[model samples]
Target: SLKVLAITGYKPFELGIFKQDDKALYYIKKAIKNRLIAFLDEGLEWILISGQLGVELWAAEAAYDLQEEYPDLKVAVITPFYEQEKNWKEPNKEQYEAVLAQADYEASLTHRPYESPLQFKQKNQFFIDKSDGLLLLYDPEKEGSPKYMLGTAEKRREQDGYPIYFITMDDLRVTVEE
Candidate 1:
Protein backbone atom coordinates (compact mmCIF):
# COMPACT_ATOMS: atom_id res chain seq x y z
CA SER A 1 0.00 0.00 0.00
CA LEU A 2 1.20 3.51 -0.81
CA LYS A 3 0.75 6.44 1.57
CA VAL A 4 0.26 9.55 -0.52
CA LEU A 5 0.97 12.88 1.14
CA ALA A 6 -0.75 15.85 -0.48
CA ILE A 7 1.22 18.99 0.46
CA THR A 8 0.69 22.62 -0.42
CA GLY A 9 2.00 25.41 1.75
CA TYR A 10 2.44 29.15 1.53
CA LYS A 11 5.51 30.73 3.04
CA PRO A 12 5.73 34.15 4.66
CA PHE A 13 7.37 35.31 1.46
CA GLU A 14 4.33 34.43 -0.60
CA LEU A 15 2.21 37.04 1.18
CA GLY A 16 4.77 39.75 0.36
CA ILE A 17 5.89 39.71 3.98
CA PHE A 18 9.64 39.53 4.43
CA LYS A 19 11.68 39.20 7.59
CA GLN A 20 14.05 42.02 8.51
CA ASP A 21 17.00 39.84 7.57
CA ASP A 22 17.59 37.32 4.82
CA LYS A 23 19.19 34.93 7.32
CA ALA A 24 15.94 34.66 9.26
CA LEU A 25 14.12 33.95 6.05
CA TYR A 26 16.60 31.25 5.17
CA TYR A 27 16.26 29.62 8.57
CA ILE A 28 12.51 29.41 8.32
CA LYS A 29 12.74 27.85 4.88
CA LYS A 30 15.36 25.49 6.24
CA ALA A 31 13.11 24.33 9.02
CA ILE A 32 10.30 23.59 6.60
CA LYS A 33 12.73 21.79 4.31
CA ASN A 34 13.89 19.64 7.19
CA ARG A 35 10.34 18.91 8.21
CA LEU A 36 9.59 17.84 4.65
CA ILE A 37 12.43 15.35 4.74
CA ALA A 38 11.16 14.02 8.02
CA PHE A 39 7.77 13.44 6.46
CA LEU A 40 9.29 11.34 3.70
CA ASP A 41 11.39 9.46 6.23
CA GLU A 42 8.15 8.45 7.87
CA GLY A 43 7.47 6.51 4.65
CA LEU A 44 4.98 7.86 2.16
CA GLU A 45 4.33 7.18 -1.53
CA TRP A 46 3.91 10.24 -3.74
CA ILE A 47 4.14 13.90 -2.68
CA LEU A 48 1.36 16.08 -4.04
CA ILE A 49 2.07 19.80 -4.23
CA SER A 50 0.15 23.02 -4.97
CA GLY A 51 2.05 23.24 -8.26
CA GLN A 52 3.67 26.57 -7.42
CA LEU A 53 7.07 26.52 -9.07
CA GLY A 54 9.15 27.73 -6.16
CA VAL A 55 7.60 25.66 -3.40
CA GLU A 56 7.22 22.56 -5.56
CA LEU A 57 10.76 22.76 -6.85
CA TRP A 58 12.12 23.44 -3.41
CA ALA A 59 10.38 20.38 -2.06
CA ALA A 60 11.44 18.34 -5.07
CA GLU A 61 15.10 19.24 -4.67
CA ALA A 62 14.97 18.48 -1.00
CA ALA A 63 13.42 15.16 -1.87
CA TYR A 64 16.41 14.55 -4.11
CA ASP A 65 18.71 15.29 -1.21
CA LEU A 66 17.16 12.44 0.72
CA GLN A 67 16.87 10.03 -2.22
CA GLU A 68 19.20 7.65 -0.40
CA GLU A 69 16.79 7.56 2.52
CA TYR A 70 13.65 7.10 0.46
CA PRO A 71 14.83 4.76 -2.23
CA ASP A 72 11.82 2.47 -2.24
CA LEU A 73 9.22 5.18 -2.76
CA LYS A 74 10.58 8.04 -4.82
CA VAL A 75 9.24 11.50 -4.12
CA ALA A 76 7.03 11.90 -7.16
CA VAL A 77 5.15 15.20 -7.66
CA ILE A 78 2.90 17.14 -10.05
CA THR A 79 2.60 20.71 -11.31
CA PRO A 80 0.46 22.53 -13.83
CA PHE A 81 2.05 23.94 -16.97
CA TYR A 82 1.89 27.51 -15.78
CA GLU A 83 2.99 26.71 -12.25
CA GLN A 84 5.91 24.83 -13.74
CA GLU A 85 7.24 28.04 -15.20
CA LYS A 86 8.53 31.12 -13.46
CA ASN A 87 6.16 33.76 -12.17
CA TRP A 88 4.47 36.05 -14.72
CA LYS A 89 7.29 38.55 -14.61
CA GLU A 90 10.52 36.60 -14.37
CA PRO A 91 11.20 32.87 -14.15
CA ASN A 92 14.01 30.58 -13.16
CA LYS A 93 13.98 28.84 -16.48
CA GLU A 94 16.58 26.21 -15.73
CA GLN A 95 15.36 25.38 -12.29
CA TYR A 96 11.68 25.11 -13.17
CA GLU A 97 12.26 23.02 -16.27
CA ALA A 98 14.63 20.72 -14.43
CA VAL A 99 12.17 19.91 -11.70
CA LEU A 100 9.29 19.49 -14.13
CA ALA A 101 11.31 16.97 -16.05
CA GLN A 102 11.81 14.90 -12.92
CA ALA A 103 8.32 15.03 -11.48
CA ASP A 104 6.15 12.00 -12.15
CA TYR A 105 3.25 13.99 -13.53
CA GLU A 106 2.32 17.42 -14.88
CA ALA A 107 -1.16 18.88 -15.25
CA SER A 108 -2.41 22.01 -16.97
CA LEU A 109 -5.73 23.14 -18.31
CA THR A 110 -4.22 25.84 -20.52
CA HIS A 111 -1.54 28.51 -20.59
CA ARG A 112 -4.10 31.26 -20.26
CA PRO A 113 -3.65 34.47 -18.27
CA TYR A 114 -4.33 34.84 -14.55
CA GLU A 115 -6.97 32.25 -13.75
CA SER A 116 -9.90 33.05 -11.49
CA PRO A 117 -10.18 31.79 -7.92
CA LEU A 118 -12.76 29.30 -9.11
CA GLN A 119 -10.34 28.00 -11.70
CA PHE A 120 -7.75 27.33 -9.06
CA LYS A 121 -10.40 25.69 -6.93
CA GLN A 122 -11.06 23.36 -9.82
CA LYS A 123 -7.37 22.70 -10.19
CA ASN A 124 -7.10 21.87 -6.53
CA GLN A 125 -9.99 19.50 -6.85
CA PHE A 126 -8.09 17.69 -9.56
CA PHE A 127 -5.38 17.00 -7.01
CA ILE A 128 -7.84 16.09 -4.31
CA ASP A 129 -9.12 13.37 -6.60
CA LYS A 130 -5.70 11.75 -6.94
CA SER A 131 -4.47 11.94 -3.37
CA ASP A 132 -5.35 9.41 -0.71
CA GLY A 133 -4.97 12.12 1.96
CA LEU A 134 -3.52 15.57 2.56
CA LEU A 135 -0.74 17.53 4.27
CA LEU A 136 -1.68 21.07 5.20
CA LEU A 137 0.57 23.96 6.12
CA TYR A 138 -2.31 25.72 7.72
CA ASP A 139 -3.86 27.52 10.65
CA PRO A 140 -7.13 26.89 12.44
CA GLU A 141 -8.54 30.33 11.67
CA LYS A 142 -9.58 32.15 8.50
CA GLU A 143 -11.77 30.04 6.27
CA GLY A 144 -10.56 31.68 3.04
CA SER A 145 -6.94 31.05 3.85
CA PRO A 146 -4.76 28.59 1.89
CA LYS A 147 -4.47 26.15 4.75
CA TYR A 148 -8.19 26.38 5.30
CA MET A 149 -8.96 25.65 1.67
CA LEU A 150 -6.77 22.57 1.86
CA GLY A 151 -8.59 21.64 5.04
CA THR A 152 -11.80 21.70 3.06
CA ALA A 153 -10.33 19.08 0.75
CA GLU A 154 -9.40 17.04 3.77
CA LYS A 155 -12.95 17.31 4.98
CA ARG A 156 -14.19 15.86 1.72
CA ARG A 157 -11.68 13.04 1.98
CA GLU A 158 -12.87 12.26 5.48
CA GLN A 159 -16.51 12.26 4.39
CA ASP A 160 -15.49 9.73 1.74
CA GLY A 161 -13.26 7.72 4.09
CA TYR A 162 -9.70 8.86 3.34
CA PRO A 163 -6.86 9.60 5.73
CA ILE A 164 -5.02 12.93 5.81
CA TYR A 165 -1.87 14.08 7.54
CA PHE A 166 -1.57 17.79 8.27
CA ILE A 167 1.98 19.11 7.94
CA THR A 168 2.18 22.30 9.93
CA MET A 169 4.87 24.33 11.67
CA ASP A 170 3.41 25.75 14.85
CA ASP A 171 6.44 27.79 15.89
CA LEU A 172 5.76 30.48 13.26
CA ARG A 173 9.49 30.18 12.68
CA VAL A 174 8.99 27.51 10.05
CA THR A 175 8.69 30.41 7.62
CA VAL A 176 5.87 28.34 6.16
CA GLU A 177 3.48 30.46 8.19
CA GLU A 178 1.29 30.56 5.10
Candidate 2:
Protein backbone atom coordinates (compact mmCIF):
# COMPACT_ATOMS: atom_id res chain seq x y z
CA SER A 1 0.00 0.00 0.00
CA LEU A 2 1.38 3.39 -0.99
CA LYS A 3 0.70 5.39 2.11
CA VAL A 4 2.36 7.59 4.71
CA LEU A 5 5.90 6.58 5.68
CA ALA A 6 8.24 7.72 8.48
CA ILE A 7 12.00 7.72 9.17
CA THR A 8 14.41 7.63 12.13
CA GLY A 9 18.13 7.23 12.74
CA TYR A 10 21.39 8.44 14.27
CA LYS A 11 22.59 12.05 14.60
CA PRO A 12 25.74 11.81 12.56
CA PHE A 13 25.89 15.55 12.04
CA GLU A 14 24.84 17.08 15.34
CA LEU A 15 28.27 17.96 16.63
CA GLY A 16 29.80 18.69 13.25
CA ILE A 17 31.63 15.39 13.17
CA PHE A 18 30.30 14.86 9.69
CA LYS A 19 32.53 17.71 8.56
CA GLN A 20 35.45 15.41 9.31
CA ASP A 21 34.16 12.89 6.76
CA ASP A 22 32.58 14.97 4.08
CA LYS A 23 33.06 12.29 1.44
CA ALA A 24 31.29 9.64 3.49
CA LEU A 25 28.50 12.01 4.47
CA TYR A 26 27.97 13.03 0.89
CA TYR A 27 27.76 9.48 -0.38
CA ILE A 28 25.60 8.38 2.51
CA LYS A 29 23.09 11.21 2.33
CA LYS A 30 22.99 10.97 -1.46
CA ALA A 31 22.23 7.27 -1.27
CA ILE A 32 19.45 7.83 1.23
CA LYS A 33 17.97 10.56 -0.94
CA ASN A 34 18.06 8.28 -3.97
CA ARG A 35 16.28 5.60 -2.01
CA LEU A 36 13.61 8.12 -1.04
CA ILE A 37 13.31 9.17 -4.64
CA ALA A 38 12.69 5.57 -5.56
CA PHE A 39 9.96 5.44 -2.97
CA LEU A 40 8.22 8.43 -4.46
CA ASP A 41 8.77 7.07 -7.94
CA GLU A 42 6.99 3.94 -6.78
CA GLY A 43 4.01 6.13 -5.82
CA LEU A 44 4.48 6.40 -2.10
CA GLU A 45 2.73 9.59 -1.09
CA TRP A 46 3.41 11.42 2.16
CA ILE A 47 6.68 11.21 4.07
CA LEU A 48 6.70 11.76 7.84
CA ILE A 49 9.74 13.09 9.68
CA SER A 50 10.30 13.53 13.42
CA GLY A 51 12.24 16.75 12.78
CA GLN A 52 15.23 15.67 14.85
CA LEU A 53 18.72 16.95 14.26
CA GLY A 54 20.34 14.25 12.18
CA VAL A 55 18.91 11.62 9.88
CA GLU A 56 15.37 12.83 10.33
CA LEU A 57 16.30 16.36 9.31
CA TRP A 58 18.29 15.15 6.32
CA ALA A 59 15.45 12.88 5.23
CA ALA A 60 13.03 15.79 5.43
CA GLU A 61 15.36 17.88 3.30
CA ALA A 62 15.59 15.06 0.78
CA ALA A 63 11.84 14.70 0.73
CA TYR A 64 11.56 18.42 0.07
CA ASP A 65 13.85 18.01 -2.92
CA LEU A 66 11.91 15.00 -4.11
CA GLN A 67 8.63 16.90 -3.95
CA GLU A 68 9.99 19.05 -6.77
CA GLU A 69 10.35 15.98 -9.00
CA TYR A 70 7.29 14.19 -7.61
CA PRO A 71 4.89 17.02 -7.19
CA ASP A 72 2.32 14.75 -5.65
CA LEU A 73 4.53 13.72 -2.77
CA LYS A 74 4.04 15.44 0.59
CA VAL A 75 6.41 15.75 3.52
CA ALA A 76 5.39 16.41 7.10
CA VAL A 77 7.74 17.25 9.94
CA ILE A 78 6.38 16.25 13.34
CA THR A 79 7.75 17.69 16.51
CA PRO A 80 7.02 16.06 19.84
CA PHE A 81 6.63 19.36 21.61
CA TYR A 82 6.79 23.08 21.16
CA GLU A 83 10.23 24.66 21.38
CA GLN A 84 11.83 21.32 20.68
CA GLU A 85 14.56 23.26 19.01
CA LYS A 86 14.76 25.67 21.93
CA ASN A 87 17.99 24.28 23.28
CA TRP A 88 19.82 23.82 20.02
CA LYS A 89 22.97 25.88 19.49
CA GLU A 90 23.25 28.48 16.76
CA PRO A 91 24.53 26.41 13.85
CA ASN A 92 22.10 23.53 14.38
CA LYS A 93 19.21 25.91 14.94
CA GLU A 94 19.84 27.38 11.52
CA GLN A 95 19.90 23.96 9.92
CA TYR A 96 16.79 22.88 11.81
CA GLU A 97 14.94 26.00 10.79
CA ALA A 98 15.97 25.48 7.18
CA VAL A 99 14.40 22.03 7.06
CA LEU A 100 11.38 23.12 9.08
CA ALA A 101 10.65 25.82 6.58
CA GLN A 102 10.70 23.44 3.65
CA ALA A 103 8.39 20.77 5.02
CA ASP A 104 4.99 20.63 3.37
CA TYR A 105 3.46 20.51 6.84
CA GLU A 106 4.71 21.04 10.37
CA ALA A 107 3.09 19.94 13.61
CA SER A 108 3.75 19.52 17.27
CA LEU A 109 2.30 16.54 19.03
CA THR A 110 2.89 17.97 22.50
CA HIS A 111 2.91 21.76 22.04
CA ARG A 112 5.12 22.38 25.10
CA PRO A 113 8.68 22.49 26.35
CA TYR A 114 11.14 19.62 26.95
CA GLU A 115 9.80 17.06 29.38
CA SER A 116 11.95 13.99 29.37
CA PRO A 117 13.88 11.61 27.15
CA LEU A 118 10.93 9.33 27.67
CA GLN A 119 9.00 11.72 25.49
CA PHE A 120 11.38 10.99 22.64
CA LYS A 121 10.53 7.30 22.75
CA GLN A 122 6.87 8.11 22.85
CA LYS A 123 7.14 10.42 19.87
CA ASN A 124 8.97 7.81 17.82
CA GLN A 125 6.33 5.25 18.71
CA PHE A 126 3.78 7.78 17.59
CA PHE A 127 5.44 7.74 14.18
CA ILE A 128 5.51 3.94 14.00
CA ASP A 129 1.92 3.74 15.00
CA LYS A 130 0.64 6.16 12.40
CA SER A 131 2.94 5.28 9.50
CA ASP A 132 2.54 2.56 6.91
CA GLY A 133 6.29 1.95 6.80
CA LEU A 134 9.51 3.18 8.35
CA LEU A 135 13.03 3.97 7.18
CA LEU A 136 15.69 3.68 9.85
CA LEU A 137 19.28 4.95 9.84
CA TYR A 138 20.50 3.01 12.81
CA ASP A 139 23.76 2.07 14.44
CA PRO A 140 23.49 -1.37 16.00
CA GLU A 141 25.89 -0.63 18.80
CA LYS A 142 23.93 2.32 20.07
CA GLU A 143 21.45 1.81 22.87
CA GLY A 144 19.34 4.94 22.64
CA SER A 145 16.88 6.30 20.13
CA PRO A 146 18.07 4.20 17.21
CA LYS A 147 17.75 1.04 19.26
CA TYR A 148 14.35 2.09 20.48
CA MET A 149 13.21 2.88 16.97
CA LEU A 150 14.43 -0.47 15.66
CA GLY A 151 12.76 -2.33 18.49
CA THR A 152 9.55 -0.46 17.95
CA ALA A 153 9.75 -1.12 14.22
CA GLU A 154 10.24 -4.83 14.88
CA LYS A 155 7.12 -4.87 16.96
CA ARG A 156 5.22 -3.03 14.27
CA ARG A 157 6.52 -5.51 11.70
CA GLU A 158 5.23 -8.39 13.79
CA GLN A 159 1.83 -6.80 14.25
CA ASP A 160 1.10 -5.25 10.86
CA GLY A 161 3.91 -6.46 8.62
CA TYR A 162 4.70 -2.89 7.64
CA PRO A 163 7.91 -2.46 5.70
CA ILE A 164 11.05 -1.23 7.46
CA TYR A 165 13.94 0.11 5.43
CA PHE A 166 17.08 -0.07 7.53
CA ILE A 167 20.42 1.61 6.83
CA THR A 168 23.64 1.74 8.75
CA MET A 169 27.06 3.37 8.66
CA ASP A 170 28.31 0.26 6.92
CA ASP A 171 25.63 0.59 4.30
CA LEU A 172 26.86 4.07 3.41
CA ARG A 173 30.49 3.06 3.63
CA VAL A 174 29.91 0.20 1.20
CA THR A 175 28.16 2.51 -1.18
CA VAL A 176 31.07 4.93 -1.02
CA GLU A 177 33.46 2.15 -1.93
CA GLU A 178 31.23 1.04 -4.78
Candidate 3:
Protein backbone atom coordinates (compact mmCIF):
# COMPACT_ATOMS: atom_id res chain seq x y z
CA SER A 1 0.00 0.00 0.00
CA LEU A 2 1.42 3.35 -0.98
CA LYS A 3 1.14 6.17 1.54
CA VAL A 4 1.15 9.87 0.73
CA LEU A 5 2.72 12.36 3.11
CA ALA A 6 1.59 15.97 2.91
CA ILE A 7 3.45 19.02 4.25
CA THR A 8 2.39 22.46 5.47
CA GLY A 9 4.38 25.24 7.11
CA TYR A 10 5.47 28.87 7.33
CA LYS A 11 7.06 30.58 4.35
CA PRO A 12 10.54 31.07 5.76
CA PHE A 13 11.64 32.96 2.67
CA GLU A 14 8.69 35.29 2.44
CA LEU A 15 10.69 38.27 3.65
CA GLY A 16 13.44 37.64 1.10
CA ILE A 17 15.80 37.97 4.06
CA PHE A 18 16.94 34.39 3.76
CA LYS A 19 20.51 35.37 2.88
CA GLN A 20 20.84 36.22 6.56
CA ASP A 21 18.56 33.37 7.65
CA ASP A 22 20.48 30.43 6.27
CA LYS A 23 20.27 28.46 9.51
CA ALA A 24 16.48 28.51 9.49
CA LEU A 25 16.26 26.92 6.05
CA TYR A 26 19.28 24.71 6.58
CA TYR A 27 18.07 23.03 9.76
CA ILE A 28 14.53 22.79 8.50
CA LYS A 29 15.82 21.09 5.38
CA LYS A 30 17.79 18.68 7.55
CA ALA A 31 14.74 17.89 9.66
CA ILE A 32 12.57 17.47 6.57
CA LYS A 33 15.09 15.21 4.92
CA ASN A 34 15.16 13.09 8.07
CA ARG A 35 11.38 12.95 8.07
CA LEU A 36 11.34 11.96 4.41
CA ILE A 37 13.77 9.17 5.17
CA ALA A 38 11.47 7.97 7.90
CA PHE A 39 8.51 8.17 5.59
CA LEU A 40 10.29 6.21 2.90
CA ASP A 41 11.38 3.69 5.50
CA GLU A 42 7.76 3.33 6.49
CA GLY A 43 6.86 2.54 2.84
CA LEU A 44 5.63 5.94 1.85
CA GLU A 45 5.14 6.57 -1.85
CA TRP A 46 4.64 10.28 -2.30
CA ILE A 47 5.45 13.61 -0.66
CA LEU A 48 2.93 16.30 -1.50
CA ILE A 49 3.70 20.01 -1.21
CA SER A 50 0.94 22.61 -1.44
CA GLY A 51 2.96 24.57 -4.03
CA GLN A 52 2.02 27.69 -2.09
CA LEU A 53 4.48 30.39 -1.24
CA GLY A 54 7.20 30.00 1.37
CA VAL A 55 7.15 26.69 3.24
CA GLU A 56 5.37 24.79 0.56
CA LEU A 57 7.93 25.67 -2.09
CA TRP A 58 10.78 24.99 0.31
CA ALA A 59 9.27 21.65 1.18
CA ALA A 60 8.78 20.86 -2.48
CA GLU A 61 12.41 21.62 -3.16
CA ALA A 62 13.37 19.31 -0.30
CA ALA A 63 11.10 16.62 -1.60
CA TYR A 64 12.56 17.12 -5.05
CA ASP A 65 16.02 16.62 -3.63
CA LEU A 66 14.92 13.48 -1.80
CA GLN A 67 13.75 11.93 -5.05
CA GLU A 68 17.40 11.72 -6.07
CA GLU A 69 18.14 9.49 -3.08
CA TYR A 70 14.81 7.65 -3.11
CA PRO A 71 13.81 7.20 -6.68
CA ASP A 72 10.51 5.64 -5.76
CA LEU A 73 9.47 8.57 -3.63
CA LYS A 74 7.23 10.85 -5.70
CA VAL A 75 7.00 14.60 -5.23
CA ALA A 76 3.91 16.55 -6.27
CA VAL A 77 2.93 20.19 -6.34
CA ILE A 78 -0.72 20.87 -5.65
CA THR A 79 -2.05 24.30 -6.45
CA PRO A 80 -5.35 25.80 -5.35
CA PHE A 81 -5.62 27.26 -8.84
CA TYR A 82 -3.54 26.73 -11.91
CA GLU A 83 -2.51 30.37 -12.07
CA GLN A 84 -2.06 30.84 -8.37
CA GLU A 85 1.44 32.11 -8.92
CA LYS A 86 0.42 34.87 -11.30
CA ASN A 87 0.23 37.47 -8.57
CA TRP A 88 3.42 36.49 -6.83
CA LYS A 89 6.50 38.61 -7.16
CA GLU A 90 9.25 37.68 -9.60
CA PRO A 91 11.59 35.76 -7.32
CA ASN A 92 8.89 33.76 -5.58
CA LYS A 93 7.17 33.08 -8.87
CA GLU A 94 10.41 31.85 -10.40
CA GLN A 95 11.07 29.60 -7.44
CA TYR A 96 7.56 28.22 -7.65
CA GLU A 97 7.99 27.46 -11.33
CA ALA A 98 11.30 25.71 -10.73
CA VAL A 99 9.86 23.44 -8.07
CA LEU A 100 6.68 22.86 -10.03
CA ALA A 101 8.70 21.77 -13.02
CA GLN A 102 10.65 19.33 -10.90
CA ALA A 103 7.56 17.85 -9.33
CA ASP A 104 6.61 14.42 -10.53
CA TYR A 105 2.97 15.44 -10.56
CA GLU A 106 1.43 18.89 -10.91
CA ALA A 107 -2.24 19.60 -10.36
CA SER A 108 -4.73 22.22 -9.37
CA LEU A 109 -7.99 22.14 -7.47
CA THR A 110 -9.36 24.60 -9.97
CA HIS A 111 -8.17 25.62 -13.41
CA ARG A 112 -9.80 29.03 -13.26
CA PRO A 113 -8.94 32.44 -11.89
CA TYR A 114 -8.27 32.97 -8.22
CA GLU A 115 -11.49 33.39 -6.28
CA SER A 116 -11.18 33.34 -2.53
CA PRO A 117 -9.56 31.78 0.47
CA LEU A 118 -12.41 29.35 0.25
CA GLN A 119 -10.71 27.80 -2.75
CA PHE A 120 -7.53 27.35 -0.74
CA LYS A 121 -9.51 25.87 2.12
CA GLN A 122 -11.16 23.49 -0.28
CA LYS A 123 -7.80 22.47 -1.68
CA ASN A 124 -6.26 22.07 1.78
CA GLN A 125 -9.16 19.96 2.91
CA PHE A 126 -8.81 17.88 -0.21
CA PHE A 127 -5.20 17.01 0.62
CA ILE A 128 -5.97 16.67 4.32
CA ASP A 129 -8.61 14.16 3.45
CA LYS A 130 -6.53 12.28 0.93
CA SER A 131 -3.09 12.11 2.53
CA ASP A 132 -2.08 9.19 4.69
CA GLY A 133 -0.21 11.49 7.04
CA LEU A 134 0.84 15.13 7.44
CA LEU A 135 3.86 17.12 8.63
CA LEU A 136 3.44 20.65 9.91
CA LEU A 137 6.41 23.01 10.14
CA TYR A 138 4.90 25.70 12.21
CA ASP A 139 4.86 27.74 15.39
CA PRO A 140 1.48 27.13 16.95
CA GLU A 141 1.50 30.61 18.49
CA LYS A 142 1.74 32.22 15.06
CA GLU A 143 -1.23 32.63 12.76
CA GLY A 144 -1.50 31.63 9.10
CA SER A 145 -2.01 28.68 6.78
CA PRO A 146 0.13 26.43 8.94
CA LYS A 147 -2.23 26.74 11.88
CA TYR A 148 -5.23 26.23 9.63
CA MET A 149 -3.80 23.18 7.92
CA LEU A 150 -2.56 21.72 11.21
CA GLY A 151 -6.02 22.20 12.75
CA THR A 152 -7.63 20.40 9.84
CA ALA A 153 -5.12 17.60 10.08
CA GLU A 154 -5.85 17.32 13.81
CA LYS A 155 -9.51 16.78 13.11
CA ARG A 156 -8.63 14.24 10.45
CA ARG A 157 -6.32 12.50 12.91
CA GLU A 158 -9.09 12.29 15.47
CA GLN A 159 -11.52 10.97 12.93
CA ASP A 160 -9.21 8.82 10.83
CA GLY A 161 -6.30 8.10 13.17
CA TYR A 162 -3.56 9.02 10.69
CA PRO A 163 -0.26 10.24 12.07
CA ILE A 164 0.40 13.98 12.35
CA TYR A 165 3.90 15.44 12.67
CA PHE A 166 4.33 18.89 14.19
CA ILE A 167 7.65 20.70 13.97
CA THR A 168 7.68 24.14 15.48
CA MET A 169 10.18 26.99 15.79
CA ASP A 170 11.19 25.31 19.00
CA ASP A 171 12.06 22.23 17.01
CA LEU A 172 14.21 24.29 14.63
CA ARG A 173 15.75 26.31 17.44
CA VAL A 174 16.89 23.21 19.31
CA THR A 175 18.39 21.65 16.22
CA VAL A 176 20.04 24.86 15.04
CA GLU A 177 21.67 25.37 18.43
CA GLU A 178 23.00 21.84 18.58
Clash pairs for candidate 1: none
Question: Any runs in candidate 3 off by more than 4 Å, and if so which?
Answer: 13-21
Best by lDDT: 3
Best first by TM-score, ranked: 3, 2, 1
TM-score of model 1 relative to the true fold? Answer: 0.66
- Over 1-178, each residue of candidate 1 has an lDDT whose tens digit, in order, gives 3367666666445544343245543544465466666665666667767556444555666666666666654555553335534453344566557666777665565566445666666667767777776655445553224664565686786688666544344544534454
- Candidate 3 Cα RMSD (Å): 2.2
The TM-score between candidate 3 and the true structure equals 0.89
CA lDDT, candidate 1, residue 85: 49
The TM-scores of all predictions, comma-separated, are: 0.66, 0.88, 0.89
- Report per-prediction Cα RMSD to one decimal: 4.6, 2.3, 2.2
The CA lDDT of each predicted structure is 0.57, 0.77, 0.78
The pairs that clash in candidate 3 are none
Q: Pick the candidate with the highest TM-score.
A: 3
Query: In candidate 2, where is summed lDDT lowest over 10 consecutive residues?
Result: 12-21
- Candidate 2 regions off by >4 Å? 13-21, 141-144
